[PDB]
Amino acid sequence: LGISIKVHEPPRKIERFTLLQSVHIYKKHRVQYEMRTLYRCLELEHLTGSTADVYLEYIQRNLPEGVAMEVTKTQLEQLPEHIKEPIW
């Protein structure tokens, strides 16, 4: 669709916490649970609002059940109003 992205991987995080294994008293033996979190970003460049709605819809109508999504658009604007030659 002519969007011109790259593919890139941020380094991982592993959340590792620890619980007691027994119920009354055996402290020296614990059970660890991992929590692996991977990271996979894309940089979506040079598109307008309507086209961003196209490709964002074509992701978010095909979004899986295990992955996440964070949308951060960098929008455009020319000039504030009373900033040209202002006195309040």
Partner: protein, 315 residues
């Protein structure tokens, strides 16, 4: 259970057809490596064990081999040594002692008429499918060694070459860095190195006086400790080029000995480009051209830390 093998082979074939249909290719060209690519993309399993994958292959690897029936309707065994149970292994042993006996006959009648490796026991029971032990395997191997010593003809060379294999490379020779030319860059090379959570990229410059620069600033100002200075002199003392290298370097992460050893490894890997190959061969067997694997291991729970138990009283 043979009929199940027929049904599985035709299902694998028509699934190949439907994979070529959904992938838009011809059923005449859609091959096994492309089959693996397509089914590997189409079903993303999140597992670490590769046998727990979505698998669609040549089904004779997927199905274990159903054994051939040794008797017809009259019930007679087809093979002569069937009644020892281990028919195939003992048949093979009989044939190999026959090859050795006619080879001894050929040596006596020659006086009268004048890299590779063995299999393992598991590979043998893969080949001849019939279970064995280890002492009978070893006896078979020792018979093969008595085969391989005699004046054996080329047919017998092929016959022992049936149970020979191909070893890997013992090819661990060091890697030369190419001499690079970046904007009149003469006497230049590079390498990388890593020891103890520390990355270091050193540059060699064969046109400079005897000192080291690190990130521009001098290695005396970078190293106040003499141990690190011996650590940097070590390869250059080994190649006798103490005054031939004013060099710039980079390092990131870790403490004094960590960054020192990482820069030493980077300089060692880099200096291959301006020496004889025997220099880095000797350096490598002096212990230079390798990564030190000693990274500190995690702590194991229920202990003080990483090896030390708590003060468990006995009483």
């Amino acid at each position: 259970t043979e009929d199940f093998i027929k049904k599985q082979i035709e299902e694998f074939n028509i699934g190949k057809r439907h994979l070529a249909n959904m992938m838009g290719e011809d059923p005449e060209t859609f091959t096994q490596e492309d089959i693996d690519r397509a089914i590997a993309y189409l079903f993303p399993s999140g597992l670490f064990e590769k046998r727990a994958r979505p698998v669609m292959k040549h089904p004779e690897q997927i199905f274990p081999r159903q054994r051939a029936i040794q008797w017809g309707e009259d019930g007679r065994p087809f093979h002569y040594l069937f009644y020892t149970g281990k028919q195939s292994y003992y048949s093979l042993m009989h044939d190999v002692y026959g090859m050795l006996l006619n080879l001894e006959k050929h040596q006596s009648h020659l006086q009268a008429k004048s890299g590779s490796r063995w299999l393992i026991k598991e590979e043998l029971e893969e080949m001849l499918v019939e279970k064995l032990s280890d002492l009978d395997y070893m006896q078979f191997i020792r018979l093969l060694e008595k085969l391989l010593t005699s004046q054996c003809g080329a047919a017998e060379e092929e016959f022992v070459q049936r149970f020979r294999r191909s070893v890997t490379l013992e090819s661990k020779k060091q890697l030369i860095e190419p001499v690079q030319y970046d904007e009149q860059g003469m006497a230049f090379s590079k390498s990388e190195g890593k020891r103890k959570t520390a990355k270091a990229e050193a540059i060699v410059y064969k046109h400079g006086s005897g000192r080291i620069k690190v990130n521009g600033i001098d290695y005396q100002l970078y190293f106040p400790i003499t141990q690190d200075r011996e650590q940097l002199m070590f390869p250059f003392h080994f190649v006798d080029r103490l005054g031939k290298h004013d060099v710039t370097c980079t390092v990131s992460g870790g403490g004094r000995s960590a960054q020192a050893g990482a820069i030493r490894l980077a300089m060692a890997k880099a200096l291959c480009s301006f020496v004889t190959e025997d220099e880095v061969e000797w350096m490598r067997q002096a212990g230079l051209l390798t990564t030190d694997p000693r990274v500190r291991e995690r702590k194991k729970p229920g202990q003080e830390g990483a090896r030390r138990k708590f003060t468990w009283k006995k009483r």
